[PDB]
Design a protein around this ligand. Structure first.
Ligand code: NA
Length: 179
């Protein structure tokens, strides 16, 4: 089967948390890039699988950028998860409730929760919920990229990383996709 291991395919928010992620998950493969969307994460996931580089646990840390197509994008990436893997979906957070995309990001997070609740080989990492509980990391920010100063960047990054680490713990006794 697929070798154990974790690969995170992530967006600009994941990239901001890169140091905290690597500290919380030593030995995880963190592939986060500014421009990544759910659409391109799906492509990256399959390219890695096809080159035999994708380990068992796949963390998709996307959703806030280009959120309009969330239903099709999240349905597709779940459908395209290869056999042999467990998937962690990191919900997105747009904090500005007046942004024209806010309702879309909120619907995307809710839809991802539905996919995780119903699919035995998926676990949620509910950053959307965590972010809402910590207004202090959003003071002075663009409401997406946590922390406006050194201390709150570190604090927000730790919260982000710990959300994913906890999801990985929850996933430990769960099945992979199999036929
Ligand atoms: Na599940």
């Amino acid at each position: 089967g697929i070798a154990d291991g974790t690969m995170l395919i992530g967006d600009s928010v994941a990239l901001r948390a890169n140091t905290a992620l690597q500290t919380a998950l030593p030995g995880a493969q963190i592939n986060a890039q500014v421009s990544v969307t759910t659409k391109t994460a799906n492509e990256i996931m399959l390219n890695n699988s096809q080159n035999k580089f994708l380990p068992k646990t796949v963390v998709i840390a996307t959703g806030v950028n280009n959120p309009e197509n969330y239903k099709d994008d999240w349905d597709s990436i779940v459908k395209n998860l290869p056999k042999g893997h467990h998937m962690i979906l990191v919900t997105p957070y747009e904090g500005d409730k007046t942004k024209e995309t806010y309702a879309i990001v909120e619907k995307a997070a809710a839809y991802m929760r539905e996919l995780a609740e119903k699919t035995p080989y998926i676990t949620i990492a509910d950053w959307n919920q965590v972010a809402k509980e910590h207004p202090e990391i959003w003071a002075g920010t663009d409401q997406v990229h946590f922390g406006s100063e050194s201390s709150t960047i570190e604090a927000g990054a730790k919260l982000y990383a710990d959300t994913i680490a906890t999801a990985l713990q929850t996933a430990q006794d769960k099945p992979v996709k199999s036929k």
